[PDB]
Amino acid sequence: QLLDLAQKHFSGLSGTYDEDAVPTLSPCRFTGSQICHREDGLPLAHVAIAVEGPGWAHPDNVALQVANAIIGHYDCTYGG
Amino acid sequence: GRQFGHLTRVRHVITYSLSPFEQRAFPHYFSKGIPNVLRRTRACILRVAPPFVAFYLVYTWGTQEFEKSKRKNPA
Numbered sequence A: 001q002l003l004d005l006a007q008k009h010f011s012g013l014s015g016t017y018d019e020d021a022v023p024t025l026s027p028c029r030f031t032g033s034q035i036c037h038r039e040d041g042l043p044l045a046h047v048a049i050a051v052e053g054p055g056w057a058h059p060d061n062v063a064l065q066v067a068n069a070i071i072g073h074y075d076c077t078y079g080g
Numbered sequence B: 001g002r003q004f005g006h007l008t009r010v011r012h013v014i015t016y017s018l019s020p021f022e023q024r025a026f027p028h029y030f031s032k033g034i035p036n037v038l039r040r041t042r043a044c045i046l047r048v049a050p051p052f053v054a055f056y057l058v059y060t061w062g063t064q065e066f067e068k069s070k071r072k073n074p075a
Helices: A002-009 A061-071 B032-071
Strands: A033-039 B011-018
Touching: none
Parallel strands: none
Antiparallel strands: A033 B011
């Protein structure tokens, strides 16, 4: 029923396609750097620190996620 | 003694830093350094040099007046 609907309503993008220009993503350079926005009028500091990860496809996102799970997450309303 | 987080109030100043491994230790060592060093020298020569010249000439005269004094010329 979904494929039926997809042909019923989306078919209308045929005719001709991609005949003049096609865009594929270029890799993006990671830079080990720092940005410090110093504001002594806000009551709490926010800090986000990161290394370069591998990307969607990489099999070793699983092991990363596991390591992340171990460290986890905390918030003042946790009862533990 | 004082420590970070207690020194003073500062608002609205972003600072962008780079890792030392991402950058070069001597960006333009001679092409910027030499223009700078002359600029630094020109800034101070009229303030540091004039007493040293004044010393040097007192030194060179004083020593020349020392030796050319104990020898005679008449009896």
